[PDB]
C-alpha cells in the first residue's frame, strides 16, 4: 500500500484522459456569458477533479516529512495556482467584488500540460523569441527616432479646426462649442485645415484655429511623445494608416508626404523584413538540429454476375469520361446568377440531376467489381462515396432552410483533378500538413486564439454593455464588440488579419487605456508570432552595291554612336515628362497648351526617323528578332494611326479619341534603355510560367468559394433606403420589395439599391473575394452578408449572423493557404533561376556587382593601431585621459540624457517649461561642442580617418546653425516652417548610440547590401506608378467626389495622382478610390455636370476600365513588391552564413 498504492493511478493513460476531457468540458463552459444557476454544481465537480488529480500527485512523489513532490516542474505551479484560486472563493468572507474571474482561464492553459506534445512546441516558441532580442532593440530605436521627428514637425497640427467668424466668455467659451466648427457630411470628426498653401482649405467665412480635442477619440496626435509613439507603431503595422496619412497632410500640407514615404520605407518595409528574416532563420536551425539529432448458387452466381463488372473501367477512357463530367459540372454551376429567368433555371435544375445520376451510378458500378470492403481502402473512393451520399441527402429532402448550403457541397469533386494536375495536389498536401505533421502547432494556435477570446470577453465584456453610449449611435452594441464569445472571437481573428487599431479605440473608450493597451498589444505580439511560425513550418516542409551598301555603314555608325544613344534617352524622358502637364488646368493656360501640341509632332517625327535608321542599319531580319525593337515598333503604330487620322480628316470618332489615351504607354520605351529596368524585367518574365501554373490553381480554388457565395447570396444584398438621408429602412417599415414599391408609387423617397460589389455573378464574386482577401472593402461585404435575409426581402440586422464563418473559412483557406502555395513556388523558382545563370544574385547589373563585391569586403574587416599621438607635451597627458573608456562611456550616457529631454516636449506647454528646456539644450550644445573641439586640440593631425568622427563634427555644426541662425530668425527674414526642420538636426546625436551596438550593425549592414538590388526594382515600380498615374489622370479627373476621392486626394493633377498610386501600392484603401468609379449613370452620377471652362461634361465613371485599372495595378504591384521582400530577406541569409 502507501507509496506503492497511491502511485499506479498516476501512470495509466486512462488517468490522463479524464483530466483531458474535463478541461475541454470546462472550456465549453467558459464560453457562456452569464452562468446559469444550475451550472454551479458542475463548477464544483471541476474543482473536485482538479483537487483529486493533485491529490494523487502529492501522494505519489515523497512521503513521511520529505520536502514536497512536484515543486520543480513549471506546470505544477499552474496547478497549484488554479487550486488555491478555486478554493479562495469558498472561504466564507474573502471577496465580493472579484474582478479577477479572468484567472479562471489559467485552467485552460492546463491543456498544454495534459495533451502529449504541446510542451515541446510552446517551449520551442519561447526559444525563438530569444533570437528576436536584437531586432526588437532596433525596432524600438527606429520607432523612437521617427517618433521624435513627427513630434518636432507635427505638433498638435491635428487640432486645427475650421471655425466660423461669428455671423450673428470671449475665446475660451466661444472656441469650445463644437457647433462653431465645420463637419463634413456627418463625419463627427471636424475637418482639418491649414494656413499653409498645399494644405487643406476652409470654405468661405471660416478660418483655421488650433482648438479642439484630436481625431478619432482624442487618440491621434503628435503632442506628447507617447501618442506619437502609438501612431508610428500604427504606420509600421500599416493598419488604417492611410487615414493617418490623409489627416496629417490636410493640416500640415501636401509636401510632408516625404515624411510618410520615408517612414513607410524605413519602418513598414525594413522592420517587417528584418523581423520575418530572423524568425525564418531561427526556425531553419531548429528543424536542422532536430534532423541532425535524429541522424545521431449464391457465391457461385454472385461471382458469375461480378466477373462482368470487374471486366470494366480498367482500359477505356471511362475513368477519363468522369473528369470531363466534373469540369462540365463545375461550369454548369458557375453559370448560376441573379436574376435568371425560367427556361434557364430549368437547364440548371434538370442538369444537376444528370451529373448526380451518373456519379451515383458510377460508384454503384465501382463497388461491384472492386471487392467491398476493400473499396474503403484507397481514400479517394471513400471521398467519392461521401460526396455521393450528401448529394442524395440534399436531393432526398429539399426542405433544409436554411441548410441548403449542402448544394454547394457537390462543388467539392473538383479535387479529384489533383491526381493528374500536380499543382492542385501541392495545395492538398499543404492543407493536409496543417492537420497532420504540423498538427500540434495549429492546435496551439487554436488554444491561444481561444484563450485570448475568453480573456477579453471576461475583462471587457461587461464594460461594453454598461458603457454603450460612448461607442455607438443609439446606445446599443456596435458591430464589433465583446459581450459574448462569438463576437470576441471575431475581434481576436480581426487583429490577426491586421486590423487591431479601430477596435482598440473602442476598448480604451470603455475600459481605460492601460488595460486595453496591455491586452491588444499582447494579442498582436503573441498571436502574430504563432501565425508566422505556422506559416513558415508549412512552407519549409512542403518544398523541403557601290552606294547602297555604302549607305548601310553610315547609318550603322549613327545608331551605334555614343552621342546618338544619349540623344534618344533624352528624347524619351522629355516625351514622357510632357505627359505630366495634361491636367484639368491645361485648357486655361493657353501658352503651355500650344507648346504641348507642337511637341506632339516633334516627338513623333523623331521616333519615326530614328526607327527608319534602325531599319537601314539592321535590316528586317535583325530588327524583327529583337523583342525590345518589337516594343518600340508597336508604340510608333499608335502614334502613326492617330496622326494619319488627324491628317485625313477623322478627327473625332469612338476609336480615334480613345487611342489618345494610349500615350501613357510611351514611358515603356525607357525599359530597354536602362540596365536597371532590363535586368528586373528579365528576371520577372523568366519566372512567369511558374506563376501561371499557380494562378490557375488560385482561380480554380477561388472558383469554389465564389460559386458557394452565389448560392448563399445573389439577390439578398438589395435594400430600400431613404435617399434624402441614405439610411436603410426598418423591417417594421419596409419588409420586402413589395412594401417599398408601394412607397415609390406613393411618391416617397425610396430606392431598391444594391451593394455594387456583391455576389450576383461569379465574376462579381471574384471581385468580392479580392476585397476580402486583402482586407480592404471586406467590412461592407460582410455587413451585407450577415444582414442577408432572402431574395426580395429587406435585410435585417445580423439576422444571418453565422455567415461570418463563411468569411473566416475563406481567409483561412483562400488567403492563408493560397498565399502559402504562391510564396513556395516563387522561392523554388528563385533557387533554380539563380542556379541556371551559373550563378549569383539576380536583380543586380554587371557594374552594380563590382560595387557590391568590394563593399562586402569593406564591411567585414577592421584596421589595427591608428595611434600616432600628440607626442610629448601637456597635450599627451590630456590624450591619456580622453582616450580612456571613462571618457568614452560618459558621452554615451549623456546622449541618453539628451534623448530623455526631447521626449518631455508637449504641445501647449508652459513658458517656464520652455525656458528650462532651452537652458538645458543650451548646456548640451556647449557640452557637445566642447567634446568635439577638445578632440581637435588633443588629436591635431587627422581627426577624420574613421567615419564616426566625421559624423560627429557635422552634427555639432548643424545644431549650432539651429541656434546661431535662430537669432537671425528673430532679427531678420523669417519662416517658422524652416525653424521646425533645422531643429531636427539634434536627432542626429541619437544615432551615435549605434556606435557600440554590434548586432544592430549586422542588421544595418546587410540592410545596406540590398540597396543596389532594391534600387533596380524600385525603378521598375516607379515606371509602373508613372504609367498608371497618366491613365488615371486622363480618365478619372472628373469622377464624382464620393468615398475616397475628395478635393485634396484625387486624380485631377499629376501631383494628386502620384500620392494616390503610392497609397494603393501598399494596397491601403484601394476600395475607396474604386467605389466612385463603379458609378455609371443616374441616380448616382450626372452625365451633364458642365464644369467650366472645359468641353468635358459629366461626373460619371467607367466601371469597366476602373475594374481593369485597380485590379491590374493590385496584381502587378503584388508581384514586384514580393520580389522586394525576396531580394532583401535572402541578403540576410548571406551574412549569417559566412559568419
Amino acid at each position: 500500500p502507501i507509496r506503492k498504492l497511491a502511485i499506479k493511478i498516476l501512470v495509466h493513460s486512462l488517468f490522463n484522459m479524464l483530466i483531458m476531457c474535463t478541461i475541454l468540458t470546462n472550456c465549453v463552459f467558459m464560453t457562456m456569458s452569464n452562468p446559469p444557476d444550475w451550472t454551479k454544481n458542475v463548477e464544483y465537480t471541476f474543482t473536485g477533479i482538479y483537487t483529486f488529480e493533485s491529490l494523487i500527485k502529492i501522494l505519489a512523489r515523497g512521503f513521511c516529512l520529505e520536502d514536497f513532490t512536484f515543486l520543480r516542474d513549471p506546470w505544477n505551479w499552474l496547478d497549484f495556482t488554479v487550486i488555491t484560486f478555486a478554493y479562495v472563493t469558498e472561504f466564507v468572507d474573502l471577496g465580493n467584488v472579484s474582478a479577477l474571474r479572468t484567472f479562471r482561464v489559467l485552467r485552460a492553459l492546463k491543456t498544454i500540460s495534459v495533451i502529449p506534445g504541446l510542451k515541446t512546441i510552446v517551449g520551442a516558441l519561447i526559444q525563438s523569441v530569444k533570437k528576436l532580442s536584437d531586432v526588437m532593440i532596433l525596432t524600438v530605436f527606429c520607432l523612437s527616432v521617427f517618433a521624435l521627428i513627427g513630434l518636432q514637425l507635427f505638433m498638435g497640427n491635428l487640432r486645427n479646426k475650421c471655425l466660423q467668424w461669428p455671423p450673428d466668455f470671449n475665446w475660451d467659451e466661444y472656441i469650445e462649442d463644437k457647433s462653431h466648427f465645420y463637419f463634413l457630411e456627418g463625419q463627427n470628426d471636424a475637418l482639418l485645415c491649414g494656413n499653409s498653401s498645399d494644405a487643406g482649405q476652409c470654405p468661405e467665412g471660416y478660418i483655421c484655429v488650433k482648438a479642439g480635442r484630436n481625431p478619432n477619440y482624442g487618440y491621434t496626435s503628435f503632442d506628447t511623445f507617447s501618442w506619437a509613439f502609438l501612431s508610428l507603431f500604427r504606420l509600421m503595422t500599416q493598419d488604417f494608416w492611410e487615414n493617418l496619412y490623409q489627416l496629417t497632410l490636410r493640416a500640415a500640407g501636401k509636401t510632408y508626404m516625404i515624411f510618410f514615404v520615408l517612414v513607410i520605407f524605413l519602418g513598414s518595409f525594413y522592420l517587417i523584413n528584418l523581423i520575418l528574416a530572423v524568425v525564418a532563420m531561427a526556425y531553419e536551425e531548429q528543424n536542422q538540429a532536430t534532423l541532425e539529432e535524429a541522424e545521431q448458387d449464391c457465391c457461385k452466381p454472385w461471382l458469375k454476375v461480378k466477373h462482368l463488372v470487374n471486366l470494366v473501367v480498367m482500359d477505356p477512357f471511362v475513368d477519363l469520361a468522369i473528369t470531363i463530367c466534373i469540369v462540365l459540372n463545375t461550369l454548369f454551376m458557375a453559370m448560376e446568377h441573379y436574376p435568371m429567368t425560367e427556361q434557364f433555371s430549368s437547364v440548371l435544375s434538370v442538369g444537376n440531376l444528370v451529373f448526380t445520376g451518373i456519379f451515383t451510378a458510377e460508384m454503384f458500378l465501382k463497388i461491384i467489381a472492386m471487392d467491398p470492403y476493400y473499396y474503403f481502402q484507397e481514400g479517394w473512393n471513400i471521398f467519392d462515396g461521401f460526396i455521393v451520399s450528401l448529394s442524395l441527402m440534399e436531393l432526398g429532402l429539399a426542405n433544409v432552410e436554411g441548410l441548403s448550403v449542402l448544394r454547394s457541397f457537390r462543388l467539392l469533386r473538383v479535387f479529384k483533378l489533383a491526381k493528374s494536375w500536380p499543382t492542385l495536389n501541392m495545395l492538398i498536401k499543404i492543407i493536409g500538413n496543417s492537420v497532420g505533421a504540423l498538427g500540434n502547432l495549429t492546435l496551439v494556435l487554436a488554444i491561444i486564439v481561444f484563450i485570448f477570446a475568453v480573456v477579453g470577453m471576461q475583462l471587457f465584456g461587461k464594460s461594453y454593455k454598461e458603457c454603450v453610449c460612448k461607442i455607438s449611435n443609439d446606445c446599443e452594441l456596435p458591430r464589433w464588440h465583446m459581450h459574448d464569445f462569438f463576437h470576441s472571437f471575431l475581434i481576436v481573428f480581426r487583429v490577426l488579419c491586421g486590423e487591431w487599431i479601430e477596435t482598440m479605440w473602442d476598448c480604451m473608450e470603455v475600459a481605460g487605456q492601460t488595460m486595453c493597451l496591455t491586452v491588444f498589444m499582447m494579442v498582436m505580439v503573441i498571436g502574430n508570432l504563432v501565425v508566422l511560425n505556422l506559416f513558415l513550418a508549412l512552407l519549409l516542409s512542403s518544398f523541403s552595291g557601290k552606294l547602297w551598301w555604302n549607305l548601310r555603314k553610315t547609318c550603322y555608325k549613327i545608331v551605334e554612336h555614343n552621342w546618338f544613344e544619349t540623344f534618344i534617352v533624352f528624347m524619351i524622358l522629355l516625351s514622357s515628362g510632357a505627359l505630366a502637364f495634361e491636367d484639368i488646368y491645361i485648357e486655361q493656360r493657353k501658352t503651355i497648351k500650344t507648346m504641348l501640341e507642337y511637341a506632339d509632332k516633334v516627338f513623333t517625327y523623331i521616333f519615326i526617323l530614328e526607327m527608319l535608321l534602325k531599319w537601314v542599319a539592321y535590316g528586317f531580319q535583325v530588327y524583327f528578332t529583337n523583342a525590345w525593337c518589337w516594343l518600340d515598333f508597336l508604340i510608333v503604330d499608335v502614334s502613326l494611326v492617330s496622326l494619319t487620322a488627324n491628317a485625313l480628316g477623322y478627327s473625332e470618332l469612338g476609336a480615334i479619341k480613345s487611342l489618345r489615351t494610349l500615350r501613357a504607354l510611351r514611358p515603356l520605351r525607357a525599359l530597354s534603355r536602362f540596365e536597371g529596368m532590363r535586368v528586373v524585367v528579365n528576371a520577372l518574365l523568366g519566372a512567369i510560367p511558374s506563376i501561371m501554373n499557380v494562378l490557375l490553381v488560385c482561380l480554380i480554388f477561388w472558383l469554389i468559394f465564389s460559386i458557394m457565395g452565389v448560392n448563399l447570396f445573389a439577390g439578398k444584398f438589395y435594400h430600400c433606403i431613404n435617399y434624402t438621408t441614405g439610411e436603410m429602412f426598418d423591417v417594421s417599415v419596409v419588409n420586402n420589395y413589395s412594401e417599398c414599391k408601394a412607397l415609390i408609387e406613393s411618391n416617397q423617397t425610396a430606392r431598391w439599391k444594391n451593394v455594387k460589389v456583391n455576389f450576383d455573378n461569379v465574376g462579381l464574386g471574384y471581385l468580392s473575394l479580392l476585397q476580402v482577401a486583402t482586407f480592404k472593402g471586406w467590412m461592407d461585404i460582410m455587413y451585407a452578408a450577415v444582414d442577408s435575409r432572402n431574395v426580395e426581402l429587406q435585410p435585417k440586422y445580423e439576422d444571418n449572423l453565422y455567415m461570418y464563418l463563411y468569411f473566416v473559412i475563406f481567409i483561412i483557406f483562400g488567403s492563408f493557404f493560397t498565399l502559402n502555395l504562391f510564396i513556395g513556388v516563387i522561392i523554388d523558382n528563385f533557387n533554380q533561376q539563380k542556379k541556371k545563370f551559373g550563378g549569383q544574385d539576380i536583380f543586380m547589373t554587371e557594374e552594380q556587382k563590382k560595387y557590391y563585391n568590394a563593399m562586402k569586403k569593406l564591411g567585414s574587416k577592421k584596421p589595427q593601431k591608428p595611434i600616432p599621438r600628440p607626442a610629448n607635451k601637456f597635450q599627451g597627458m590630456v590624450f591619456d585621459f580622453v582616450t580612456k573608456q571613462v571618457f568614452d562611456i560618459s558621452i554615451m550616457i549623456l546622449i541618453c540624457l539628451n534623448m530623455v529631454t526631447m521626449m518631455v516636449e508637449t504641445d501647449d506647454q508652459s513658458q517656464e517649461m520652455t525656458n528650462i528646456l532651452y537652458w538645458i539644450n543650451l548646456v548640451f550644445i556647449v557640452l557637445f561642442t566642447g567634446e568635439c573641439v577638445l578632440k581637435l586640440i588633443s588629436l591635431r593631425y587627422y581627426y577624420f580617418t574613421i567615419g564616426w568622427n566625421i559624423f560627429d563634427f557635422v552634427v555639432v555644426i548643424l545644431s549650432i546653425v539651429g541656434m546661431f541662425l535662430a537669432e537671425l530668425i528673430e532679427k531678420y527674414f523669417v519662416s517658422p516652417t524652416l525653424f521646425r526642420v533645422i531643429r531636427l538636426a539634434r536627432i542626429g546625436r541619437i544615432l551615435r548610440l549605434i556606435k557600440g551596438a554590434k548586432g544592430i550593425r549586422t542588421l544595418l549592414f546587410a540592410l545596406m547590401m540590398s540597396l543596389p538590388a532594391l534600387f533596380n526594382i524600385g525603378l521598375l515600380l516607379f515606371l509602373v506608378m508613372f504609367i498608371y498615374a497618366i491613365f488615371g489622370m486622363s480618365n478619372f479627373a472628373y469622377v464624382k467626389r464620393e468615398v475616397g476621392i475628395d478635393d485634396m486626394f484625387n486624380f485631377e493633377t499629376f501631383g494628386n495622382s502620384m500620392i494616390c498610386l503610392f497609397q494603393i501600392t501598399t494596397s491601403a484603401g484601394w476600395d475607396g478610390l474604386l467605389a466612385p468609379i463603379l458609378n455609371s449613370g443616374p441616380p448616382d452620377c450626372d452625365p451633364d455636370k458642365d464644369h467650366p471652362g472645359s468641353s468635358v461634361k459629366g461626373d460619371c465613371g467607367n466601371p469597366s476600365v476602373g475594374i481593369f485599372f485597380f485590379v491590374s495595378y493590385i496584381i502587378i504591384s503584388f508581384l514586384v513588391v514580393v520580389n522586394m521582400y525576396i531580394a532583401v530577406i535572402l541578403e540576410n541569409f548571406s551574412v549569417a552564413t559566412e559568419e
Binding site: 457630411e185 456627418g186 449611435n473 446599443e476 458591430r479 464589433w480 439610411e727 436603410m728 455587413y783
Partner: peptide, 16 residues
C-alpha cells in the same frame, strides 16, 4: 440616425 457615408456610422450604428 447619422450619415451612412462615414466609416463610423457604419460600424457603430444600426441604421446603416
Amino acid at each position: 440616425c447619422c450619415n451612412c457615408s462615414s466609416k463610423w456610422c457604419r460600424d457603430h450604428s444600426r441604421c446603416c
